[PDB]
């Protein structure tokens, strides 16, 4: 029911530039957002729950932030740039709706 949209779906080539993957939901979200990492057709798992804290089995280089409707995850030091889709799932109410993104 709650449509999930991303402010940026494709990242333009910008070396040494500010990185922020944002998600804009249909209505406000009380920080019930999940961040999902996945390798090439493998290693699908989440990293951040509640938009701020990590899964505790992943290194602290991942860091999410935001308040209200727009939540952005930032990358401190990028190490690789490959084709790997991202996910942006809200948890306010049923059903669970995911998002999308392209990073790393």
10's enclosing H/E stretch is none
- Structure tokens belonging to residue 100: 């999308």
Among 48, 73, 86, 97, the residue binding other proteins under the rule CB under 8 A is 97
Binding mask 54-73 for other proteins (x = CB under 8 A): -x------------------
Return the number of other C-beta atoms located less than 10 Å from residue 51's C-beta.
Answer: 22
Among 19, 24, 87, 103, the residue binding other proteins under the rule CB under 8 A is 87
Examine residue 22 and tell whether it contacts other proteins (CB under 8 A). no
**DSSP letter assigned to residue 50:** T
Examine residue 36 and tell whether it contacts other proteins (CB under 8 A). yes
Q: Tokens 């932030």 label which residue?
A: 65
């Amino acid at each position: 029911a709650a449509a999930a949209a991303a402010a940026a779906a494709a990242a333009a080539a910008a070396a040494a530039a500010a990185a922020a993957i944002s998600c804009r939901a249909s209505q406000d979200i009380s920080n019930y957002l999940n961040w999902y990492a996945a390798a090439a057709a493998a290693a699908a798992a989440l990293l951040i729950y509640y938009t701020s804290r990590l899964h505790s089995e992943v290194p602290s280089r991942f860091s999410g932030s935001g308040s209200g409707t727009d939540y952005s995850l930032t990358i401190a030091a990028a190490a690789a740039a490959a084709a790997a889709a991202a996910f942006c799932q809200q948890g306010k109410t049923l059903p669970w709706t995911f998002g999308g993104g392209t990073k790393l």
